[PDB]
């Protein structure tokens, strides 16, 4: 119930307070999957992109409190291109049977194999896809090693 | 109860966007808005490889509010544009008209992208879009126009424009 090898220490520690995991069914898997998404965000943005996913806002929320204007919106994209374009990272079962979740938060969909959707592949450079496909290959190894295939597929659905 | 040429996602998304039961020809209007939404999607299959267009139509208001803050732009919830060019920084509304000839801005807030029932683009609209995008729209609207005649709901569509 602790962290896997392929997940960075930085990412796992960062993921703890972002969501109440024990509350959720397959809470540990759910946490690991979100850590995949966040890692892909880092890989894509390693600057063109700001990674909004799991960003510290407490200082911002604090300033809004003192001026009573408006707290920052919860519904944030995972990352934002400064083209002025927002993106959300998805993990899917079928690139084929895929439809866009938002026309504003554009989807960057991937297989568990690490295969990008057609639009997603255009955005990325080959350098970035190889890291993501390389990273998600390590992830899937851990998935089968713990026989957690069904839990992950369900969590994707 | 969806027509075939309309995608299942588009049809599911369209249900709650407007109270269709309330309207005179509510079913037709639901499908007509689905054309507009599809045309928005067809237009937004264009990349710079970043997406050229954001499609504001039938989006969660929280999402619209967020980017508009980031793009330093703003529209009334009544008249919000259907899509926004991210390169040119110009907002658009998809119109379906019978006559392209005499057309001039519907709104001073956004530029209009008008199309026929045949699938022919207006002059200003054609200047903005690429041929790639028009053939998709003209191809899709031929599928639509066939479905209209196949079910003989032709006049009902013409009036409500």
Author numbering:
A (entry chain B): 2 to 47, 55 to 90, 92 to 166
B (entry chain A): 3 to 50, 53 to 165
From the paper:
The three largest gene segments of the Thogotoviruses, THOV, DHOV and JOSV are homologous to those of IAV and code for the heterotrimeric polymerase. In this paper we present the atomic structures of the putative PB2 cap binding and 627 domains of THOV and the putative PA N-terminal endonuclease domains of THOV and DHOV. However, the critical active site residues in the putative cap binding and endonuclease domains are not conserved in THOV and DHOV and, contrary to the case of IAV polymerase, neither domain shows the expected in vitro biochemical activity.
The corresponding construct (residues 1 to 169) was cloned, expressed, purified and crystallized. The structure could not be solved by molecular replacement using that of IAV PA-Nter due to low sequence homology. THOV PA-Nter comprises four principle β-strands surrounded by six α-helices. In chain A, this element is positioned as in DHOV and IAV (see below) whereas in chain B it is dissociated from the body of the protein, rotated by 90° and inserted between two neighbouring molecules in the crystal. For THOV and DHOV PA-Nter the putative active site is more like an extended groove and furthermore, is positively charged. The extra positive charge in the putative active sites of THOV and DHOV PA-Nter arises from the replacement of acidic residues and the introduction of extra lysines (Lys38, Lys61 and Lys97 for THOV and Lys39 and Lys100 for DHOV PA-Nter). Surprisingly, for the THOV domain, addition of Mn2+ or Mg2+ ions destabilises the protein by 3–6°C. Interestingly, the significant difference in thermal stability behaviour of the THOV and DHOV domains correlates with the enhanced plasticity and much poorer diffracting crystals of THOV PA-Nter.
